[PDB]
């Protein structure tokens, strides 16, 4: 081969994505991403609060007990955020040749800058939500444990300094570099 | 107790994350530690850049511009009057053998009348992009006519032929794909391969064993890898080579692509309008069907059809994808109307009668037989063109080149590769320039002594990636008479013998 | 100077003046319907549009109760 442009699928329990070469990194990432640029814009921080309020109202219109409304809104918001951000790997439209085929949106936010104000806000929101919501199901221990597990294992662990570009081959042999 | 402690634990970590590092960056490929501001300005003031363009070798390489012929107030035809060296030398009534137009059907009266009517009723400028009120309901007619004439499902137009291949191939390939291409493709194909960003392999020029072995090894490796999905694969070649002039064995390629599940991409710039009983293309030559034999076909309208532009042929899905996935199609203006109408009229005329193709084939065969069976030129030059080709290519024997200039093709190729790899500012090679000067001297001698104009292969060695050598080219067209061509062949042979 | 161009009369100007003179008791409903339709995503839909309009009417009835 005179170019050697191949994608590897090495198999290991814990693995990381390789650093990009000069051609892939310095040259193929020059134009705006158009996928994570919208995060820092006008009115892009109140939408989360609006969504939470609308979800709470919608779940309250059914007429359930106070505990179940809060549990349902917590779980649905966290699951939706995880599905939108931390699940898909790639971009919905060709960028240059497929340079962003191994990074999620959370890893594409702010051009791979670890600690930015928007990331701090997006990590602070779940903690405040849990602290507000837990006052309504303190008596029941099972609901407390389930909500704590959902908040920590899904809404906090993926957002860490560690577990960045981290891959596990249990659900499938992933493609790194 | 237990409940209170958990709440405090989450709160405490939120403060630490808020008071994190000062926006830690990403580890790039270059970095330098901190140093005092005061000594930074010394580095800024000590920087010395290079000139935008190197003027050192301009004077020695400037003889190419002064030798370019210029036509004086008449269309390019068989007999022209030319001036050279800023009107310093002038020649009148010069026989021409350096025109790419073969059929010469675009100079007839009906085409001129159609062009005049289209100009009167439509204008000269398209004035709009492809998607913003650009189509002038003649582009659709031309597309339908091309699709019906060439026996396919659809065709897409392009403003320029040189920017057709580098715009369609990258749209269907990305990283992780496999492309197998011949080692004699032209410059636009090389640019398309470079912009494709995919794995590229090379096999020997017209050798089926190498292609079969490469395909077998790749298929075995892919089967062993057990990939979740099947990547896209392609085979790249062309009908008649622009630098050599040979032909492609279509049946073997079809059999191999059917056996190993590949796809075929073919450039037909020099084959459309010259091969086949009527002129359909390469498929008619071997008595096959273009619908199944070839998957992607690229053609140009300027060589023989007589108007600027190009086209890409295929099925409905590919054209629909190209409508939005081609950079050249989306971000460029539409083609004018008179060219479209003239091309449609030429297609109708070619469908009506097929005498020009027969005359062109007879002339090409006669020229090849004249320059193929001469024994006095055996020790000096060789012919590297197929008998069915309409352009004759002549090269020098390796023994003569080694005797005179003392260099070989492999050494030149490796020297150029090393210079390109090291990224040198100045790239000058002496024996190549000497050989080019010798060929230009031959051409000038022929033109001065016998009033016959022939061309020389104009290439830029810096942009080339594959081996190539200078050569001479002779063209033909259907409008000439056999007597003049017969006289010109002997004249060129005499000039070649006299120069050597 | 005359050109072969046809001019469409403007509504509320020689359109609702000469032909007919009825423009009352329907402006409010038209405005409400236009606002409701334009401020919600309906045109890029096909028959999930019906399902969503039913959803919103149901929220309305239940919440009003």
């Amino acid at each position: 081969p005179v170019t050697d442009h191949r994608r590897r699928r090495a198999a290991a329990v814990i693995s990381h994505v390789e650093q990009e070469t000069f051609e892939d990194e310095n040259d193929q990432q020059m134009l705006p991403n158009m996928n994570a640029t919208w995060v820092d814009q006008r009115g892009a921080w109140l939408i989360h609060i609006v969504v939470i309020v609308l979800l709470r109202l919608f779940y309250s219109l059914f007429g359930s007990t106070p505990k179940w409304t809060w549990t349902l809104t917590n779980m649905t918001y966290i699951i939706g955020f995880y599905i939108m951000f931390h699940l898909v790997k790639g971009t919905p439209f060709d960028f240059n040749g497929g340079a962003y085929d191994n990074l999620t949106m959370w890893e594409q936010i702010n051009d791979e800058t670890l600690y930015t104000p928007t990331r701090k806000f997006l990590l602070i929101v779940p903690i405040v939500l849990f602290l507000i919501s837990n006052q309504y199901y303190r008596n029941d221990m099972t609901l407390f444990l389930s909500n704590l597990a959902v908040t920590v294992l899904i809404g906090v662990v993926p957002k860490l300094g560690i577990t960045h570009r981290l891959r596990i081959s249990i659900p499938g042999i992933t493609g790194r570099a | 107790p237990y409940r209170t402690t958990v709440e405090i634990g989450l709160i405490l970590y939120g403060i630490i994350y808020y008071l994190s590092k000062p926006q830690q960056k990403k580890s790039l490929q270059a970095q330098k530690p901190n140093l005092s501001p005061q000594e930074i300005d010394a580095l800024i003031e000590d920087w010395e850049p290079e000139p935008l363009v190197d003027p050192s070798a301009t004077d020695e390489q400037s003889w190419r511009v002064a030798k370019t012929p210029v036509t004086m107030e008449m269309p390019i035809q068989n007999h022209i009057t030319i001036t050279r060296n800023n009107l310093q030398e002038k020649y009148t009534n010069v026989f021409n053998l350096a025109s790419n137009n073969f059929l010469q059907l675009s100079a007839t009266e009906p085409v001129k009348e159609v062009v005049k009517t289209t100009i009167k009723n439509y204008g000269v400028g398209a004035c709009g992009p492809a998607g913003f009120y650009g189509n002038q309901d003649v582009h659709y007619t031309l597309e339908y006519d091309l699709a019906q004439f060439f026996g396919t499902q659809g065709s897409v137009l392009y403003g320029q032929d040189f920017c057709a291949a580098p715009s369609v191939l990258p749209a269907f390939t990305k990283r992780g794909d496999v492309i197998v291409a011949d080692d004699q493709v032209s410059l636009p194909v090389q640019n398309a391969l470079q912009l494709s960003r995919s794995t590229v392999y090379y096999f020997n020029h017209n050798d089926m064993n190498s292609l079969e072995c490469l395909l077998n090894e790749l298929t075995e490796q892919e089967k062993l890898e057990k990939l979740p999905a099947i990547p896209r694969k392609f085979i790249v070649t062309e009908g008649i080579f622009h630098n050599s002039g040979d032909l492609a064995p279509l049946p073997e390629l079809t059999k191999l692509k059917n056996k190993y599940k590949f796809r075929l991409f073919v450039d037909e710039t020099f084959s459309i309008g010259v091969l086949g009983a009527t002129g359909r293309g390469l498929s008619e030559h071997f008595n096959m069907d273009r619908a199944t034999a070839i998957d992607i076909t690229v053609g140009s309208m300027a060589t023989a059809l007589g108007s600027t532009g190009g086209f890409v042929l295929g099925d409905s899905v590919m054209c629909l994808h190209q409508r939005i996935g081609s950079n050249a199609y989306c971000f460029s203006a539409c083609l004018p109307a008179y060219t479209v109408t003239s091309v449609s009229k030429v297609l109708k005329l070619m469908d009506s009668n097929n005498d020009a193709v027969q005359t062109l084939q007879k002339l090409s065969k006669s020229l090849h037989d004249s320059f193929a069976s001469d024994d006095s030129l055996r020790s000096y030059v060789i012919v590297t063109s197929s008998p069915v080709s309409a352009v004759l290519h002549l090269q020098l024997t390796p023994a003569y080149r080694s005797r005179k200039f003392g260099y070989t093709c492999e050494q030149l190729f490796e020297t150029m590769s090393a210079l390109q790899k090291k990224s040198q500012t100045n790239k000058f090679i002496e024996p190549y320039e000497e050989e080019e000067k010798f060929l230009q001297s031959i051409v000038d001698h022929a033109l001065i002594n016998y009033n016959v104009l022939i061309t020389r292969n104009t290439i830029v060695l810096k942009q080339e990636t594959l081996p190539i050598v200078p050569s001479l080219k002779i063209c033909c067209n259907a409008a000439m008479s056999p007597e003049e061509l017969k006289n010109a062949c002997e004249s060129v042979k005499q000039s070649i013998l006299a120069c050597c | 100077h005359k050109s072969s161009m046809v001019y469409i009369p403007t509504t509320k100007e020689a359109k609702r003046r000469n032909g007919k003179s009825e423009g009352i008791l329907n402006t409010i409903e038209e405005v409400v319907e236009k606002l409701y339709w334009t401020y919600y995503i309906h045109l890029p839909f096909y028959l999930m549009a019906s399902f969503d309009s039913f959803f919103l009417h149901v929220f309305f009835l239940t919440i009003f109760s």
């Binding site: 310095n26 | 270059a30 400037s62 009723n121 000269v124 400028g125 004035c127 659709y140 | 403007t10 995503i41």
Partner: protein, 555 residues
């Protein structure tokens, strides 16, 4: 019915055809002269924004659309495979394209596809003829009937009204066809060159003001096949983020390192240059060979002018090189029509490389590059298009020469100035009226391109459709071409339009925007800092007189 019909041209008298193509001036008071800014720097422009609930509604609509599209895609391609045969593997062959890479075109744009790619016929002058069609299914296929109707032209790249069928340019083109045939021999190096090409090159070089220039058949190829001639892997390129695709393709083919700076940020550019000069090459820390800065004259999407004096000062201080694109600025801006160099007063010798395109303003097809003597001498030998591509035909050359001579003033005196004044006055009048009505308009005071903001998604199709019922043609753009919040409609003005047509357009746009609730102005657009909600009659009566004063424009 399925195929697009071939329309026979109508028979009309000559005067009516001329009126259809080019308008006729009514009064001499509708002309404005453009001044040159000698010593005034450009202030940073100010933008206006709507209230929050518009943005929140846009976000909610996009979320709903994305969720529904993904759910439908999954369910349809899981529970039935016979209908979706073009997206699945068949007998060991991969499909042409992928599911995820073409989601937006398949699920978002296919629902309003009738708003794009409208076929037309005839000359694209003041009034453009459009062919009637009926959509079937949901914009899947179309049925055509033999009916064509005229519409007002506001979507064509005709700035000076040179797209005419009767005039000096058409006669010159016909005479050129009679003399030189439509055949081109081949590449310019072999046989292709003629004396007409030399004349055109000399005329372009004299017109621009530089020392030498070259011409090419296609504008896109000019950028595509230029940067690889004098650039390699040891050079740095700094370019704005809002650049055309051709420049990006050329830089990608070149292979040099690329860095970008935010739009209209001089401090960021200075910091980037100061950092990159010291940092050096990767993995070796040697100094860079050279630094090139690429910029555009006028940006078509927003109509904003680049800051030329600051760029010149920076390149003089740090010893860099300058490349300027002038696709939308040549022949339409400045007191005479030379370009941004005449507007800012900067000498043309300071800019290293200049580009231009003949398609926008001269009614032809081609491009040109301008530079000094030795640079052009080296580039002629080092270029690829010269010795590998075709050559521009004679009629286009004749049309371009006639247009350039008319603009310069050598032939047909008193025509270029008239067109320039008309286009300037029309642009300023439309911009001022639209801003006074209560809309949001971007761009500088005198820019041919007027973008009008339509924030909500559902407001983009309907608007256009309404304008189709009132005989007006418009062009709309949205995501991903533009930012998510900003979906807009672009107005392209011509020098052929008349003030009465502008009044008709203003009335219809005012009524449509009133119906669709598109008036959202925060009072920062006015020069006196108050909200403006004027009546249409008062605007029409007062705007033409106050259009001349430059104190009513914030930027």
């Amino acid at each position: 019915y399925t195929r697009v019909p071939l329309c026979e041209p109508e028979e009309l008298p000559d005067d009516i055809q001329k009126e259809n193509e080019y308008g006729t001036l009514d009064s001499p008071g509708h002309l404005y002269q453009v001044k040159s800014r000698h010593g005034k720097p450009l202030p940073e422009p100010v933008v206006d924004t709507p209230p929050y609930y518009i943005s929140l509604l846009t976000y909610l609509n996009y979320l709903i659309l994305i969720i529904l599209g993904h759910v439908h895609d999954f369910l349809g391609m899981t529970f039935q495979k016979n209908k979706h045969l073009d997206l699945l593997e068949h007998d060991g062959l991969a499909p042409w394209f992928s599911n995820f890479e073409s989601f937006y075109v398949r699920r978002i744009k296919m629902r309003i596809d009738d708003c794009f790619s409208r076929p037309t016929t005839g000359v694209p002058g003041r009034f453009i003829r459009c062919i009637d069609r009926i959509s079937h299914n949901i914009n899947e296929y179309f049925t055509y009937s033999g009916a064509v109707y005229p519409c007002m032209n506001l979507s064509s790249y005709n700035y000076l009204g040179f797209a005419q069928s009767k005039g000096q340019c058409t006669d010159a083109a016909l005479e050129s066809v009679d003399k030189y045939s439509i055949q081109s021999g081949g590449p310019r190096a072999q046989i292709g060159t003629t004396d007409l090409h030399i004349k055109a090159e000399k005329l372009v070089a004299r017109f621009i003001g530089k020392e030498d220039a070259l011409v090419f058949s296609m504008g896109y190829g000019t950028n595509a096949n230029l940067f690889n001639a004098f650039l390699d892997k040891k050079c740095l390129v700094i370019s704005d983020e809002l650049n055309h695709t051709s420049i990006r393709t050329g830089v990608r083919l070149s292979g040099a390192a690329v860095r970008t700076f935010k739009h209209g940020d001089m401090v960021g550019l200075e910091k980037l240059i100061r950092e990159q000069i010291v940092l050096g090459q990767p993995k070796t820390n040697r100094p860079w060979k050279k630094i090139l800065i690429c910029a555009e004259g006028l940006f078509s999407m927003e109509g904003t002018l680049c800051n030329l004096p600051k760029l010149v000062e920076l390149k003089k201080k740090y010893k860099c090189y300058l490349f300027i694109d002038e696709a939308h600025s040549i022949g339409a801006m400045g007191p005479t029509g030379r370009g941004v160099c005449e507007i800012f007063g900067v000498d043309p010798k300071d800019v290293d490389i200049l580009m231009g395109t003949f398609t926008k303003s001269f009614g032809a097809a081609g491009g040109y590059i301008a530079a000094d003597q030795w640079i052009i001498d080296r580039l002629r030998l080092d270029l690829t298009t010269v010795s590998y591509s075709e050559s521009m035909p004679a009629p286009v050359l004749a049309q371009t020469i006639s247009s350039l001579q008319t603009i310069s003033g050598e032939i047909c005196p008193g025509q270029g100035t008239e067109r320039l004044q008309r286009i300037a006055f029309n642009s300023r009048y439309l911009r001022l009226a639209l801003q006074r009505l209560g809309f949001i308009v971007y761009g500088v005071a005198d820019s041919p391109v007027i973008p009008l903001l339509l924030y909500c998604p559902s407001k983009m199709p309907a608007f256009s459709r309404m304008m189709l019922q009132r005989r007006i043609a418009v062009v709309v753009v949205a995501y991903p071409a533009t930012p998510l919040i900003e979906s807009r409609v672009r107005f392209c003005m011509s020098a052929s339009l008349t003030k009465e047509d502008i009044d008709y357009l203003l009335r219809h746009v005012s009524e449509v925007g009133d119906k669709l609730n598109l008036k959202s102005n925060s009072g920062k657009s006015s020069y006196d800092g108050k909200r403006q909600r004027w009546d249409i009659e008062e605007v029409i009566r007062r705007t033409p007189e106050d259009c001349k004063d430059d104190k009513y424009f914030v930027n």
